[PDB]
């Protein structure tokens, strides 16, 4: 996507993570509880599913770009 | 009228805030929010958190710290309160001077009074009814003397009631010694001084009955 | 208003205290007797080729990715 939005994402899922008077900047991990995070995980995801199948493999189950 | 809280933080409610922290501390924001009737607890905790809270700081960066900040963007990118920490300062302030680098009354007056009126009146119910019943019972006590005081200026001598006893084993404390634990047994001679002690109560109470 | 404990309740007074005479339940004679002793395909990846700390256990660690999803 478009840089900023990108930079937008990163900086929601770092946030400072109260909990009942404790808190803490959520320096390192995904929140999964914001709305669009989910998209942010399956786009993690698809990364994951590269590496275990390789570009060759991917390529063939999901087609040819076109069709 | 009732309504959904937010707005901005006039200068008064900053410092009705600040006040209120130093009363009840950093983690009871519920309370906090009460005091304020414009604004929320998680606004005047994040308030706090950002703004308001002294070991903060606004100071401009040095060179070295414009490099310092600047270097942890280029390297952590828009993890602003990561950054925040890293720097040691509060994040939008960091923010912006990145951003730069790159390139009524009577309301008022109203929630102050209670503000004051609050801060000064630190007791739970409790107490303040048992003050209340403490004066209560003084004055009782007067009114009483005043009766039996004006019985005797009439003639009528009344003896005062006692308490009436709460339990079976409860005590008066001027029927008799109270748990009369004597002195250690007498190596020096105290005989004359008992006598000499005896006749200065009896006097005493002399003087008293004479007062 | 209410307030932590500083100087035990002292046996001394129960001690002095007369005594009850009511029959608890436990005190019913239980084990009256004693006992005694005797005296091609995987080449084409990305990548083809104790703590005495109750927070930092292990176990704890395990148990907490177990129980939170």
């Known amino acids: ?67 | 009228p009732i309504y959904v809280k937010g707005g901005v933080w006039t200068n008064v409610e900053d410092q009705i805030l600040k006040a209120a922290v130093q009363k009840y501390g950093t983690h009871q924001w519920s309370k906090v929010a009460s005091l304020l009737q414009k604004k929320t607890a998680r606004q005047s905790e994040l308030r706090w958190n950002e703004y308001l809270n002294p070991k903060l700081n606004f100071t401009e960066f040095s060179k070295e710290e414009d490099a310092q900040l600047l270097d942890l963007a280029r390297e952590l990118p828009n993890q602003w309160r990561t950054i925040a920490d890293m720097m040691a300062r509060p994040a939008q302030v960091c923010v912006e001077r990145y951003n730069r680098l790159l390139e009524l009354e009577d309301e008022e007056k109203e929630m102050l009074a209670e503000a004051r009126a609050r801060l000064l009146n630190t007791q739970g119910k409790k107490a303040t009814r048992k003050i209340r019943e403490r004066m209560l019972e003084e004055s009782k006590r007067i009114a009483e003397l005043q009766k039996r005081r004006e019985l005797k200026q009439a003639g009528i001598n009344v003896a005062i009631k006692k308490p009436k006893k709460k339990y079976g084993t409860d005590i008066d404390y001027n029927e008799d010694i109270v748990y009369e634990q004597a002195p250690m047994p007498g190596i020096y001679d105290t005989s004359t001084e008992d006598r000499q002690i005896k006749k200065k109560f009896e006097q005493f109470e002399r003087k008293v009955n004479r007062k | ?69």
Do not use: C
């Open chain 1, 1 to 67: 996507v478009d840089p900023n939005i990108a930079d937008y994402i990163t900086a929601k899922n770092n946030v400072v993570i109260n909990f009942k008077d404790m808190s803490h900047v959520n320096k390192y991990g995904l929140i999964r509880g914001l709305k669009f995070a989910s998209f942010i995980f399956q786009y993690y995801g698809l990364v994951i599913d590269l590496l275990l199948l390789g570009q060759e493999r991917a390529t063939d189950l999901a087609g040819p770009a076109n069709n």
């Open chain 3, 1 to 69: 208003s209410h307030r932590p404990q500083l100087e035990a309740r002292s046996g001394a007074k129960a001690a002095a205290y007369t005594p009850t005479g009511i029959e608890h339940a436990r005190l019913l004679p239980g084990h009256t007797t004693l006992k005694y002793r005797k005296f091609s395909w995987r080449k084409g990846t990305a990548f083809g080729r104790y703590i005495n700390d109750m927070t930092k256990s292990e176990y704890h660690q395990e148990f907490l990715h177990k129980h939170v999803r």
